Design a protein around this ligand. Sequence first.
Ligand SMILES: CNC(=O)[C@H]1C[C@H](n2c(-c3cc(OC)c(OC)c(OC)c3)nc3ccc(C(=O)NCC4CCN(C)CC4)cc32)C1
Length: 297
Amino acid sequence: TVARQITLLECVGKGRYGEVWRGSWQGENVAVKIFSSRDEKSWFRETELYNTVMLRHENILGFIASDMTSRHSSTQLWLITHYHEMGSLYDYLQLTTLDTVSCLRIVLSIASGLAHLHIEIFGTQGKPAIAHRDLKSKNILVKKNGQCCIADLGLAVMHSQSTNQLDVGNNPRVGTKRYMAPEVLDETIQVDCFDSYKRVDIWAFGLVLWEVARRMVSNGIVEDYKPPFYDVVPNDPSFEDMRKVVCVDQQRPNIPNRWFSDPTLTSLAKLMKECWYQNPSARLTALRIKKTLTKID
Ligand SMILES: CNC(=O)[C@H]1C[C@H](n2c(-c3cc(OC)c(OC)c(OC)c3)nc3ccc(C(=O)NCC4CCN(C)CC4)cc32)C1
């Protein structure tokens, strides 16, 4: 169903993943992702997660439907979700700066969505723990109320007390290299250990925090948008570029001096560094981050 009722109006994204369209379903905007063949298995994993898990949370992208539809003499794989007209956090941050409240609301809402993903709730009305594995600004959408929701669950891995085996391939280097945690890049991560995947999300969250904080204005000062590690790796960095910086040199994004003139950015700088520990077990939990951000307000 639904695929029939949907008219595609304008393509708002196109890449190796496929395309994302603004469509109309009974006159209502929906986001339609048409997967590339390359990413067909992500469509299935994401579809099955959303269809089997009650994953309704204000800070997780709202699923509507999935469909298989043959159109251009070939089958199309569609994922249909709520449409967030503001688009991705990545693109939003390049258009505007943030005051203190808008910055906190963004980062807290991401922490809230990530904590909800991570938490296992027993039973019906509950949910397995979920690790995202590709958290970054391009996979986060901004809402008009200034909160964000986390998107793109095609690499996510789930865990509950039902089974010890995880639906993860043998290759741990699945995400976006620029955001890959050190234990992924050097491939020492314990693929058997679900908690290890949560900690990889926390590392990436720290990087997103840094990206956002750079755009918060303090005393008329603000940084331009940059991706993590812009100053030391080329675009489309290689595994080796990333490993030398992050694993061998053990470098991190630098904190602009101006942040320490503002107590919010001072607090956030402290927080992102607690997300970036080389040792995964020292990193704050998602819920700890959320509780901390609830108080920094
Ligand atoms: C890696 N970047 C991407 O993919 C791109 C396309 C993704 N996009 C998703 C989306 C949908 C999904 O499924 C259906 C996904 O997968 C679950 C998903 O994953 C991240 C994202 N909804 C969107 C809603 C709107 C827009 C958008 O830009 N409109 C244009 C206006 C923006 C603001 N003014 C300044 C300019 C014009 C873009 C959206 C982001």
